[PDB]
Design a protein around this ligand. Structure first.
Ligand SMILES: Nc1ncnc2c1ncn2[C@@H]1O[C@H](COP(=O)(O)OP(=O)(O)OC[C@H]2O[C@@H](O)[C@H](O)[C@@H]2O)[C@@H](O)[C@H]1O
Length: 170
């Protein structure tokens, strides 16, 4: 946990414009969050990017987990190996609002973060799943009480997130 270059938004939320995988390799974090689906299929996005960097070790361990325990709940989580990227990997499932999943569960999904004192995380539901990233950052800041280090990959999205957060801040 040697996080460098993060802007601090609140007492426990930090943000940085980085690739979450490059971040993980460099910082070797205790916990890296994966933006997961219910069957733990890491195709594309953060999940696929992380899986590739373990040369598909993650996807194999994931598939064994689903086979034993069945799908995760939307808004739920499971802790697996972090492989070469971290000690552990917390797969957290946020609502796919694009497919009509309840946006309320984004808050339950962020509540999983509070079981770890330090995390390297992306924004849940803010890509393929279609939530407003500003909304997702807002619920993260309102929900997570532990120290979360957000890697936002796209520069324009990151700029807009730090702007909007600080304009609406109180
Ligand atoms: N390499 C990356 N590094 C950092 N942030 C990233 C990266 N790739 C995407 N992001 C950002 O992380 C946030 C989450 O994007 P997704 O990974 O698409 O997350 P989510 O919306 O929860 O999508 C879940 C779905 O995506 C699939 O990969 C996954 O298997 C599941 O089906 C968004 O802001 C997105 O721009």
């Amino acid at each position: 946990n040697s996080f460098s270059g993060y802007l601090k938004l609140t007492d426990n939320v930090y943000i940085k414009n980085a690739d979450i995988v490059e971040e993980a390799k460099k910082v070797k974090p205790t916990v890296v969050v994966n933006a997961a689906n219910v069957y733990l299929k890491h195709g594309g996005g953060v999940a696929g990017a992380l899986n590739k960097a373990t040369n598909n070790a993650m996807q194999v361990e994931s598939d064994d987990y689903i086979a034993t325990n069945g799908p995760l709940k939307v808004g739920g989580s499971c802790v697996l190996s972090g492989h070469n990227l971290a000690k552990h990997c917390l797969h957290v499932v946020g609502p796919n609002v694009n497919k009509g999943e309840d946006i309320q569960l984004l808050k339950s999904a962020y509540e999983n973060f509070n079981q770890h004192e330090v995390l390297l995380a992306p924004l849940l539901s803010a890509g393929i799943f279609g939530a407003d990233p500003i909304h997702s950052l807002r619920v993260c800041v309102d929900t997570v009480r532990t120290n979360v280090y957000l890697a936002v990959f796209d520069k324009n999205l990151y700029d807009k997130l730090v702007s909007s957060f600080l304009e609406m801040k109180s």
